[PDB]
Design an enzyme around this catalytic site. Structure first.
Site, PDB file in Angstrom:
ATOM      1  N   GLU B 171       0.811  -1.207   0.000  1.00 15.51           N
ATOM      2  CA  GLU B 171       0.000   0.000   0.000  1.00 15.51           C
ATOM      3  C   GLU B 171       0.850   1.265   0.000  1.00 15.51           C
ATOM      4  OE1 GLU B 171       0.900   1.694   3.068  1.00 15.51           O
ATOM      5  OE2 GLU B 171       2.047  -0.207   2.827  1.00 15.51           O
ATOM      6  N   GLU B 314       4.565  -0.353   1.451  1.00 13.98           N
ATOM      7  CA  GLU B 314       4.716  -0.429  -0.012  1.00 13.98           C
ATOM      8  C   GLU B 314       4.762  -1.850  -0.540  1.00 13.98           C
ATOM      9  OE1 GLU B 314       8.094   1.803  -1.429  1.00 13.98           O
ATOM     10  OE2 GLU B 314       7.475   3.646  -0.342  1.00 13.98           O
TER      11      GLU B 314
END
Ligand SMILES: COc1ccc2c(c1)ncn2[C@H]1O[C@H](COP(=O)(O)O)[C@@H](O)[C@H]1O
Ligand SMILES: COc1ccc2c(c1)ncn2[C@H]1O[C@H](COP(=O)(O)O)[C@@H](O)[C@H]1O
Ligand SMILES: O=C(O)c1cccnc1
Ligand SMILES: O=C(O)c1cccnc1
Lengths: 346, 346
Positions: B171, B314
């Site tokens: 994310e 991430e």
């Protein structure tokens, strides 16, 4: 040897400061990559690395040897498995072999004292056909320990000349978890019961006997904890000695060494006792499932990266951690920078 | 969607039994490779894997979105960093990007609700320009949550059609650790103080405010812990929803998904609440340095392999663990066998 030891370089604080600053400027919140950042900084301080975290060629050195203490009933694997498995190393069918191939590392099999005929394809540095039974006397002579240390050290640094920048250490020797426990007990001041494990599937019943053997070994030899060579020679093994020698050689060479499991922790304790300058070149891999692992690691002040409940040895854990090392380098060299994006974070 | 959920396959016990037997016969003491063995067996049970641990192509799906709760002062990164960093993902300069490249995985950047103009090169699945501020109301409507779940699920399974066999979730969304904490508190029954962390470097002083916000969010929305979609919609975010959707899609597809860090644990809790059948497809990567990590993992009954003190997000941790997955496969397929050496061990 004292020469050798004298010449181990200290880490380059200058390169480390530059590294830290570069890392801090990368495209992420400062310190967000945690131990990967710390690792990168560690590598930058290693003189054989040319002021930056980098990985060239990789090698795993596997030290094979037999132990007289096997006769004490401390291991369920047949003695011959050492010779057999060592041969298999040449065929790429073992665990380290497969994991090293995955990591793009080369495996170097070294015979430091297998009790069998020489194996073709294996590097020959054989001290003797197995070491002395530590339960009734020393494993070898000081002289023998020192010579081996020397020989392995040199072999190690010589590879550096060929492009190797990252080493991994490993072993092979039925019954080796016994001397490994003895050393740990000695260096850490822990009682044998606390550090003796099941090794390669020793039945729980058989444990008591292994503990007794370790205690006897110690009582009998009276190894001096303040003298790592004394300890190795008395209650260690050729394989343990060989691993310690890889550590001394890499450090002299100013290069990083990845530890493996339990056997390796014992060798690391010795190496650090022998030469504290060695420490900064050591990189833990995984957290061995051997009972005495926590105690050993606490004494080295090391926290492994991988929790895999592994207990194979051979340098398998070392191989498995190599990609992590390469990751730290990749981060360092390939990430973009905050400034270039006009990003400003506290 | 209920269709989707209904159709998640159970694991293949037959393939797993065969796998276990094969592993036990390998050139090593039985069970000596610990969690690598367990992992191999897990993969063999996954239907999309064709009865064996194998890894074809790899993908990391990064779900990006903005959050209204940012206005509450719970994050020090400027709001715009989401849009910026998302663009950087297209340039291969971010942490996940670099780590994924190292693992030979492809990064898929998906915009599920960035509060900015559409970014070229980014997959467009935008719900809205940022989600609602959970401190004063719900993040979105149930309808919106369900549609996104659906859309992402399908996207995920479709990649399977292209050769992808291993997914990683990630994310990007400034302030996302806040809804993540809210969900964790809700699903685990833990008090907010216990699960609220510093996220992307929140100053220690500012913590109290973040805790208050989480509590308000809960009090105000009254999310029902027994309904994962309810929770996601009320106190989650588009990005969190998107991650849950990747998990549902991979499982439906009978494929493995590697978790990342804290944000991912929250999404995993939801996914498992929504469909317990999802669990067996989940593989932890690392142990996030976020305060609420332990609590979250305990509830998922998961023990990560990597202890790196990472807190970037991430999907960086996911990428870092991919080599481990490949290692399990390598072990399985490339090791030699005991019998072939005439070796017999207890
Ligand atoms: C194929 O059979 C084997 C058996 C053991 C093996 C091995 C392969 N590879 C490593 N070990 C491990 O087991 C031994 C240490 O445990 P213990 O002290 O109980 O003997 C060493 O050979 C160590 O390398
Ligand atoms: C280049 O700047 C950044 C900043 C944050 C980043 C990032 C890059 N990549 C991930 N995060 C992480 O930080 C955010 C969660 O923390 P908080 O809840 O405190 O905002 C998310 O974007 C998460 O992905
Ligand atoms: O931790 C190890 O390396 C280990 C443990 C048991 C047997 N052989 C090796
Ligand atoms: O654990 C994570 O993934 C994390 C923690 C803090 C900020 N962003 C991500």
């Amino acid at each position: 040897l004292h020469a050798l030891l004298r010449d181990i370089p200290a880490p380059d604080a200058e390169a480390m400061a530059r590294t830290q600053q570069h890392i801090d400027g990368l495209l992420k919140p400062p310190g967000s990559l945690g131990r990967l950042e710390t690792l990168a900084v560690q590598l930058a301080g290693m003189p054989g690395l040319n002021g930056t975290p980098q990985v060239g060629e990789k090698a795993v050195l596997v030290m094979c040897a037999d132990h007289g203490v096997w006769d004490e009933g401390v291991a369920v694997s047949p003695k011959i498995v050492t010779a057999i498995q060592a041969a298999n190393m040449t065929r790429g069918t073992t665990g380290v072999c497969v994991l090293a191939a995955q990591a793009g590392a080369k495996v170097h099999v070294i015979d430091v004292g297998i009790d069998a005929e020489p194996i073709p394809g294996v590097v020959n540095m054989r001290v003797a056909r197995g070491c002395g039974n530590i339960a009734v006397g020393p494993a070898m002579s000081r002289l023998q320990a020192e010579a081996l240390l020397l020989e392995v050290s040199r072999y190690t640094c010589d590879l550096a000349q060929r492009g190797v920048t990252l080493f991994g250490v490993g072993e092979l020797g039925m019954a080796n978890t016994t001397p490994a426990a003895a050393m740990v007990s000695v260096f850490t001041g822990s009682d044998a019961k606390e550090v003796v494990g099941i090794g390669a599937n020793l039945p729980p019943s058989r444990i008591d006997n292994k503990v007794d053997v370790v205690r006897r070994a110690i009582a009998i030899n009276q190894p001096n904890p303040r003298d790592g060579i004394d300890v190795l020679s008395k209650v260690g093994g050729f394989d343990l000695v060989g691993m310690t020698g890889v550590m001394l050689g890499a450090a002299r060479c100013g290069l990083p060494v990845l530890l493996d499991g339990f056997l390796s922790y014992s060798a690391a304790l010795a190496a650090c006792q022998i030469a504290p300058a060695v420490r900064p070149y050591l990189i833990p891999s995984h957290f061995s499932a051997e009972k005495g692992a926590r105690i050993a690691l606490a004494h080295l002040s090391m926290e492994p990266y991988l929790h895999m409940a592994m207990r194979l040895g051979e340098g398998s854990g070392a191989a498995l951690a190599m990609p992590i090392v390469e990751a730290a380098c990749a981060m360092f060299h390939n990430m973009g920078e905050l400034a270039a994006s006009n990003i400003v974070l506290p």
